[PDB]
Assembly symmetry: D2
Homo-oligomer: 480 residues x 4
Amino acid sequence: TMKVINDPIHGHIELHPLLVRIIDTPQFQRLRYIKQLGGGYYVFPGASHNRFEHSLGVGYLAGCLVHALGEKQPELQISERDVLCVQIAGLCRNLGHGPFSHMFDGRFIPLARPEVKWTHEQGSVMMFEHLINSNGIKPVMEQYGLIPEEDICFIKEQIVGPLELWPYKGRPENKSFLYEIVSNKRNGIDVDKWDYFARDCHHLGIQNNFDYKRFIKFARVCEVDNELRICARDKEVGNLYDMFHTRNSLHRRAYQHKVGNIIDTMITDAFLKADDYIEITGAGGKKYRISTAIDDMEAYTKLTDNIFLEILYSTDPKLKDAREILKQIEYRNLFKYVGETQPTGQIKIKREDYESLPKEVASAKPKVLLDVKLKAEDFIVDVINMDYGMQEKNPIDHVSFYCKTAPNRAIRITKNQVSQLLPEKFAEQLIRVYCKKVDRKSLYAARQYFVQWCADRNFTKPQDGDVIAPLITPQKKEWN
Amino acid sequence: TMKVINDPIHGHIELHPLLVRIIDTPQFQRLRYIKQLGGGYYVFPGASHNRFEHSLGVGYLAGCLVHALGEKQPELQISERDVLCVQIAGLCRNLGHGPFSHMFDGRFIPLARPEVKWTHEQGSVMMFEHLINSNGIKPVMEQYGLIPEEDICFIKEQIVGPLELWPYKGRPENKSFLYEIVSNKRNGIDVDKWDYFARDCHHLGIQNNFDYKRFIKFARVCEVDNELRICARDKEVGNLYDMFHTRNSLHRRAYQHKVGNIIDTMITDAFLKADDYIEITGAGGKKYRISTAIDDMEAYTKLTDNIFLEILYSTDPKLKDAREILKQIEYRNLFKYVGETQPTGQIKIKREDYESLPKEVASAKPKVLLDVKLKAEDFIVDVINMDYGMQEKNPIDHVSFYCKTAPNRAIRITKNQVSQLLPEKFAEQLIRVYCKKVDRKSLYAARQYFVQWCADRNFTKPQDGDVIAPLITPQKKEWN
Amino acid sequence: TMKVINDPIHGHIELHPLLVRIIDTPQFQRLRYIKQLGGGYYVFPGASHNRFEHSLGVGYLAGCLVHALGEKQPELQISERDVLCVQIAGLCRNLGHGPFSHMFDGRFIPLARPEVKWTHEQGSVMMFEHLINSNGIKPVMEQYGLIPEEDICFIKEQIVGPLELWPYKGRPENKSFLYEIVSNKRNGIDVDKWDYFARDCHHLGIQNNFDYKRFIKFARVCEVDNELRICARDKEVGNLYDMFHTRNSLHRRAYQHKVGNIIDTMITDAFLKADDYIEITGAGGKKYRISTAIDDMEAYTKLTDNIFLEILYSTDPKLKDAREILKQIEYRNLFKYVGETQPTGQIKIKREDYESLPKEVASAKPKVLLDVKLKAEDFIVDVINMDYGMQEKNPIDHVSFYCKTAPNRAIRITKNQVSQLLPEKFAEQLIRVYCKKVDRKSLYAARQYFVQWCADRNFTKPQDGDVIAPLITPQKKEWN
Amino acid sequence: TMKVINDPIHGHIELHPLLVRIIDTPQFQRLRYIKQLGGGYYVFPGASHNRFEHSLGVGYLAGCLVHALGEKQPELQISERDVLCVQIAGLCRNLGHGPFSHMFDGRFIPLARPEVKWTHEQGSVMMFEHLINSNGIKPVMEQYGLIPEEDICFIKEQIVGPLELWPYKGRPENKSFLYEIVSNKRNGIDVDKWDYFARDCHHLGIQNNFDYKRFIKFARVCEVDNELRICARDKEVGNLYDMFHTRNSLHRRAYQHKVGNIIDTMITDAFLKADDYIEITGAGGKKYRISTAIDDMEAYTKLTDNIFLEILYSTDPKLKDAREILKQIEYRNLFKYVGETQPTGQIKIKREDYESLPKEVASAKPKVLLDVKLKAEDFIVDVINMDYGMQEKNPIDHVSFYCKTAPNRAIRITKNQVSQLLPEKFAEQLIRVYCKKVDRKSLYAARQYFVQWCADRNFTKPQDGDVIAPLITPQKKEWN
Ligand SMILES: Nc1ncnc2c1ncn2[C@H]1C[C@H](O)[C@@H](COP(=O)(O)OP(=O)(O)OP(=O)(O)O)O1
Ligand SMILES: Nc1ncnc2c1ncn2[C@H]1C[C@H](O)[C@@H](COP(=O)(O)OP(=O)(O)OP(=O)(O)O)O1
Ligand SMILES: Nc1ncnc2c1ncn2[C@H]1C[C@H](O)[C@@H](COP(=O)(O)OP(=O)(O)OP(=O)(O)O)O1
Ligand SMILES: Nc1ncnc2c1ncn2[C@H]1C[C@H](O)[C@@H](COP(=O)(O)OP(=O)(O)OP(=O)(O)O)O1
Ligand SMILES: [Mg+2]
Ligand SMILES: [Mg+2]
């Protein structure tokens, strides 16, 4: 019967035997060897935590919220079956993450298999399928009153959305609210965030400005457009705006730390140079690469942060180039950050243009004395899209609220009904430039190119522009 | 010699004997009987803390920062004398607060002595003067190397600004940075905030999004316009914006909680009805009122939260009206919140108009069935100015930064150099309306007046407008 | 309907309307004006907390545990009625505390009304009776399914024990376990402790070594001697020992801090000198003293920490003596701690003997040069009984455990089955001596008397004996 | 110049450039891949932390304490040189740890190379030597005013004790107190503990009962027996006893968790079965085993937790046996805990007897019906020595204290001068028995053997003895 796990964020979590059974598989335990924050550990030494513990946390909160709704509203007829299905989805939405988490689907796969479209969510589903089949979980699900045909569909839909109008098959419109819990496609307000805010802050040594327990206490289900949706108490609208401010602030300080990102980049680089030579045994002894392990779940199961050390410790001279990069990390000879700027007004930059940016920076011609001349391959240019989870859209516009005087009546709240101190935009781009040539003079040069390039493209003045390129900044009137 | 105090926020604080001597006086100990958050305790039961502990905290952080600067830059020639003066100012800037803190100078005095102009800062200075003189502190200051003539001036200036060009007398332009520590008139970034953020969050059960220790580690002094000012590392600019976001959020959730404010109001009302009958003995046996105790520091010394209980426990029928209000608080029959709205576009409301607003709301004529008709005296209207500490101004525009490549060279950073996700405005007004008549029907009515009044004045649509006044909201096109 | 309160220790607590109604009375709200830790605030400035918030906490935890038992074991047939009754007892066990909490029943009443026997528990019951009657709570109890005759008895028994074998009337032997929750007379393991551990640590700035949530998750009810009792999982026995270690450690560092205690003593002294002159209006306009207010609950209601300030701020020269003592506290001219010692071996000291100890210390004749000669009235001697809650008894010997392999079978665990690193004794006495004469030479003398007295009585050598009385310590062989 | 690192336990730590240089080496960065708590991660999912972060913490606290002593007492003439040497020793005392930390030197090496004597301390020294030489650190040490000949000796002595009367060469008797900071051989009170208490509690979700900051504030150096030693303020003696209670409690609940230990045991077993086949390249391409990598630091550098996954992911059938054990861990088919007991009175068990205990348990002949008969190889028996760090000795007897009235005069404090509630013994043994045969009937049998064996050897009655072996416990009178 049921187990208790002590978690520093949530305290003692009770786990239903079915969930234990799911947890105690190689597919799930694999998450113990995948850092939540990837290269962030190398900047924030507190951040040792792995996707495993985060997954328990999500599972538990999913459970908390669904239970709370059932207690508050029996009329919903939430069953233990529904509860466990939501918890399982909670536990399992991180199953698909690869080495160093977002480094893998955010940097490595895009560059190593550009044609394929892949997300950790896709992978979570496949890994889940594989986990169920490989471990005879279906019988156990039935033993506790679950219906695998319907429920496995439901669970997958919770994670990834429809597998193709009410587009969901796993549950009907009257249980629409269950899809809003683990991975909310409508506005991004889900228990996944709540766990990582708390867990990441605890580990990074930053403090979390969002109360998820509070939010659970005020959550109700109401009818909205013939769907039953989760609604938040009206006055909590400020807390929701703050939730996304907090998310943005965590990305600014931690998830997109300039050095954290450059380490992610150097690791990705090394993975690219090892991809040809590393072999991972999949189903039936068949062999895959780092970049193809995503095609066989038995291979993907063995693909974790360990790869990094496999490479670092290798003696094969095939891997000399990859290994040498990782060693530079250890000695802390990293590519050097040059600076940060943003596009101006309407200007927006797409993924297809990314490869051509180092070339543009090298093409800048600053009117300054240069010892060394720098080449496109010497520049790395990271473009980062910061938003409130919905590109240009305001997610609070996609949230339903209920007032105390009419608790069953859903309503909408506009930005102007809340505050004038809110942002007018909800998306932006940051551009970081780094140089692969580390010496004083290369770095000095790189600054001139960079700042010149900003001026050429009419980007925003880097904060330290006047100090790093005092001869370049005067040419631009707007800058001063 | 020196004492150690254990504080839940800062741990063990060391106190120089001179500071102990200052602390162990009636004037200072008085702060033990003054709640930091006033009426907020009646909403947030964690908020039992008094100004006393907050004052130690401020003192300590003042000391931390001044010491840190001296360690980092000996060339500043910060003396122990300077350190103690800053700490004393730190300890003493809350000396002038009255019962329930901001209730007293924010609500009570304005209404009870409208002709006088008064602030707790004014009072801190007078109370400090009184504390020094009444306790023979001057000899002790000299004993530890302080020069009372110069230093007492310095201390007062730190708290209140110039007592009347370099306008400060207590210290020269080369020590300009010492004025920026305890009460920063230039941009509001001071240790007072840092302590209350941490202390209030710990007690309220909210979490603080600002790392003051970090800020202290990155603080340097640089020349700016022939002044030596405290400068912050450039990349910490985001943390500063977040500091004020946090401040605004604390006000939204706690310091301006609608019910917290109404309790402050009811306490103010009771004080008004007792002001004629409560007598407080000042200097030479002379007697004062609650509203006149501010004229004699010996009387003000005895004016604390105790007044509230004096009134509650009184048997004198003179005080029946005041006592009856406090009893309604105990039974939780409070004035009832009707709703909240804001002015539109440019509209701004001054203090002189405040008294006339209940009258405007009563003058609204909603086209709805009314059992009761409500009068101006039945309405309370609270107008709340939310800003980043400098009305319409952005305080980060008044902050100086230094880059890592040129640490002595101060620079400025504009909003656009940081983010497009920042606010476009830095000030706003909230209007809350409450009704003194509590029954169902008076309340129902009050909602109609309120919503009608909003429509009449072209204010923003209250969030729950459609639910509380469904017959009123349709008339306004813009609202729907 | 139900309210949510944000508590820093427990987060958001939900409160049933009935409990709200009980809370929103003058008798309950009174607890807002009574410091949990009395004089400890004057040592630990974090400790601003009042009995009110503690009481909410205890209420909530009582609820948590009773709910957990019902969820785990439906066969117990715990009703909502039972739940609310336990919560009410939880909320209400601190109702009887007087000014500065344990100062009042621990020091003041014993000295001021020696003939009467009184405890805050007695008073909690009376105040509860008074609260129910004075506020028409009985109808509201019936409205929510409670049976006042039985339930009010039950609630009182939970707080104070039997009002006179199964000695309880409010509930039968089959619900015996409900008595173990709020105030466990059998072994002292109850939710009251769990709240104060957490709450006091949070405020004092100390850290709590006991996980009550864990304990709740492992709690079961089992049959023991034809009673149904709460049983703890066997392996949690170490945690229980640690619970009492933590309690003892809190008393050592905080609740019995030498200076905290002396302040309690000086406050008590001032109350004694004011007792004749302070009048408090009880039932029918009849008037009481501080020391007699315990006889009429209407008067006791108005007896709070406020008394302290009433006295401090008084101008009546009747109160000059009392007032002067409080002023010495403010200036921090406190009675001076001389030292601490313990009885040896079997020696135990009774409460009646307390009055004769100052006399013994003054009777010591140390062979040393004395400027001043000290008198019995110049000495204060505080005797403190430190135990695990049950004098000489080990409370874990009165705890029932269950094993995982037979969850319904209760068992006992002896000390030797746990560890040899546990204490061999569970009770002891500390003796502190203070001098009322504060000057260098009186204090120097006092140390000689004290240390001599220790030697005479064959008490333990004070830790600093050799430093304070180097001429006295050599005479005792055992000491060196 | 200097770097700042954000640590969740200590906040922002400043690092001197020299220390950064030491940190940014393969030898130091290796610690990132070694779990502080080894197998405890598999029980406490919060415990993801590695030795790396702990090492920074120790470095920083070493620095805090030495600085504090210098500030308090300039007469000590502590130089920046001394400071950095202490910090380097702090950073580097964990350099020698092997995979899963104490699993490696506590279980694996003892069994795999019984003839060799080895500790992580030995290895820390060797790894340090290797780190200095392999990275040209000596020049950098000289650049900052260090004298490698004297200082490297000093640093090593701090870690391991004398390398062979004042037995230390690195510094004279007048700087004796510097040896007490990083690794205190006299009484075990050092900054290593302080960091792990705080860091481990934060991660395990347990709470730490020891205030190291406080202790640093009250630490002074005094003369004791012609040495200058660190002394603690007398009244802090209780906090020290509590420090060790906390240590013992952490071991009870976490470091010696029965299942955590069994996982360590299964990992060890797998390492043994892989030891023959895993090869690790050391100096000059020469190859070592897991068990011999301790002989060449270049090989040891590459020996980390990674080994575990290397084995788990291997396809080599040489490793089938090792791999199969790790897989049982992943599926959570672990050896089963049977129970725990202790020796009685004087009985003590030496290391030489350990191998023979499974045999004794199998030799027990319980008078009960047995389906299966169990063999010595089916039993694991773990013997755990719990003490206060000094076997039978009380470490507080080896601590020096200073009183407030004579701060330069060291003194001693005995147990009886503190409390009678302290332990009478400071060392004990726990015996845990596990069965490798997991089925119902094997497990049932195992309990009979175990309990019978306890009875035979006159060990303490297992807590659940009566439930698991009701037929066996009656035979022993003492048990009942
Ligand atoms: N004393 C403690 N305090 C806090 N957390 C603990 C303590 N002991 C164990 N834990 C943690 C470790 C685990 O994540 C979780 C479960 O541990 P534990 O209760 O010992 O389970 P177990 O499986 O070992 O016991 P059993 O199977 O015998 O019930 O709680
Ligand atoms: N063991 C403790 N742990 C944490 N904080 C403590 C402890 N003991 C006391 N404190 C707190 C309470 C006070 O605010 C502050 C100082 O108390 P303390 O150190 O006992 O000074 P004291 O003035 O009582 O002793 P002395 O006058 O003999 O130096 O520290
Ligand atoms: N944003 C917040 N975060 C954390 N706690 C909060 C926040 N806002 C309020 N609290 C606390 C203060 C109270 O103790 C508790 C209840 O406050 P609140 O939810 O505002 O009730 P209320 O009575 O004002 O609203 P209503 O009656 O309109 O539901 O929550
Ligand atoms: N906003 C933040 N709040 C708290 N900690 C932070 C924040 N930003 C960074 N940190 C942490 C992460 C690192 O462990 C440590 C180093 O900080 P950081 O200033 O990012 O150094 P850096 O090397 O990237 O700056 P630079 O090299 O430009 O001086 O501080
Ligand atoms: Mg003292
Ligand atoms: Mg850097």
